[model samples]
Target: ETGDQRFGDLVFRQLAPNVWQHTSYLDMPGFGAVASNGLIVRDGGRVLVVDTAWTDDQTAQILNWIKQEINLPVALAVVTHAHQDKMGGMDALHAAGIATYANALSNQLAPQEGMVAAQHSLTFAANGWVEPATAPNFGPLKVFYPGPGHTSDNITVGIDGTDIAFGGCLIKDSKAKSLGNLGDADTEHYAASARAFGAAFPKASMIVMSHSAPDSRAAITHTARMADKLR
Candidate 1:
């Protein structure tokens, strides 16, 4: 359905100039595609990785491509959310000597936040996640933890000098029929988070949703209006 190409087990596409989204259709059988999403952002000669994939193999494939294509090292890695699909391959990336980073709370709660039956935990053992307490920051990529939306640990990445916000799974694609699986949404908090995102990133010309299309302000507004009408 994504119309993306797959080389072996990884499905990916270069959605923007320096951004590539990786999706592993590690489908949950009857549940459909449990496609894990990730991004690689190139800044100057260095690169910033957003959410390592859901498994070691997938992450390895991604890193291999990045290394081969860009020839730049991963200056920083960020786990957009505490989910395994987002942070599962971190240990592998760390083993490769790449410093990893995450929201301050993600570092604190990864141990206590019990595992859910998702890709991250299915690949890594239960409670296998550990916060990257000592990871270093990337150059100008500022991470903003603008409150809860998707989950308590959701974080957004901002590329300095560019009106671009990696919304993670915070803001759904404006053209999407639904706001994604709201099974984890903090209704009151999610709405507030959306408003905060709207205010904080007012100049954001583009929004990179982890799963769907990257949208413009008009697209985002249209998506919101559509959701309202559907309700």
Candidate 2:
């Protein structure tokens, strides 16, 4: 439970009273790889999962942590982006009756595009994968659909009481040395989304990105600055 093993073992630590961070590194001996650092928050006995890792084993491990830690069911599973590393484990959560969520277009294209992207990954070959027949609905969850950034369907989740926002990959933590992967980002819309988020959530003091730690209001502004720089 020390050193990189803590990361290799995917340590789940309670950051806030109900907010938790699951840290893991998927380093395959051979073939391709899937590595991610993600978080999950439980508010008022309702759970909201931010991102999904690539492999079924990895996904199961995260779910297992939830199963052991919390009594309430996962109310919503938010996939930050369309990437397999972020949405591959959705089926597992779906089976547990947890409602899944993503951007409008992402929900639309998840069955087709998200599944395809997942299958292309090495983990899909090792463990069988099944795409959901239909996209998930938001219900009461407030999702920030930042047009097109990092991917056409990049989205973030806004937690209720804490007013904390999961930035996904669009907005990295403030100290992030470089912007996240832009293979599918629309710089214009991405920047616009940053501004919109800044204006929309003035009370948002904590911003959590996918790979890095949480940031304060200053970090949120830093994200806006990065997005602006992209343009």
Candidate 3:
């Protein structure tokens, strides 16, 4: 409800004590304007960021805010998937000499999607690749890849000391009656992925989706139901 900062169409809201959500709008060819969400966590004098905005400029603004406002240097940056909304700032982050990590599948698929091969190209300079797994500890967060739904490399990041799960695009928001955008989705296996994800983090107090507000654990079921209907 408070400590919300706005820069042009981008906004960052403090969701928890040290957790903030940065949201920005992107204009898709046919979808028009769509909001993308990312997470920023400040742990002492270090910070960890999950995902990025739709463009380098937007991500630069986020990094600037982290430096100017938070006054903490970023320790790590993780990409939730291969989509532009998640990894579009890869180059920018690398330019700033920051390490970025993403699922191995995402690195392999990035070139096919017209994005840079982060893991392969940035291997020497960045943390590079992460294997698909369940809740692997990464600094102040735990990364989980329940399975493929929205994208083959989609993942969820759980705060180490909290019940918050950044579900990315794999979990839908409560208001999403159906799978929002299935252009790059595996519809047939979507429900299975959601079900596994639900089982994996059954106690998640809050689940943050890429496009909407954070919701309760029921949001996982909402996504599963929508996947079942669409499948």
lDDT of each: 0.65, 0.61, 0.78
Off by over 4 Å in 3: 1-3, 120-137
In candidate 3, what are the lDDT values of residues 107-187, reduced to their tens digit? 888888876645432111122123434223356776667777998778777886777888898888877767776899988
Task: Score every model by TM-score.
Answer: 0.77, 0.75, 0.89
After TM-score superposition, the amount by which residue 120's alpha carbon in candidate 2 deviates from its true location, in angstroms, is 23
Among residues 3 or more apart in sequence or in different chains, the pairs in candidate 2 whose N, CA or C atoms overlap within 3 Å are none
| Tens digits of per-residue lDDT for model 1, 137-161 | 4555656666666777777766666
| Deviation in Å, model 2, residue 200 alpha carbon | 2.4
How many clashing residue pairs appear in each of the predictions shown? 1, 0, 0
* Runs in model 1 lying further than 4 Å from the true structure: 1-7, 113-137, 218-231
The window of 10 residues in a row where model 1 has the poorest summed lDDT is 116-125
**Models sorted by lDDT, best on top:** 3, 1, 2
Alpha carbon lDDT of residue 153, candidate 1?
70
**Model 1 local distance difference test score:** 0.65
lDDT of 2 at 26: 61
Q: List the residue pairs that clash in candidate 3.
A: none
Q: What is the overall TM-score of model 1 with all chains considered together?
A: 0.77
Candidate with best TM-score: 3
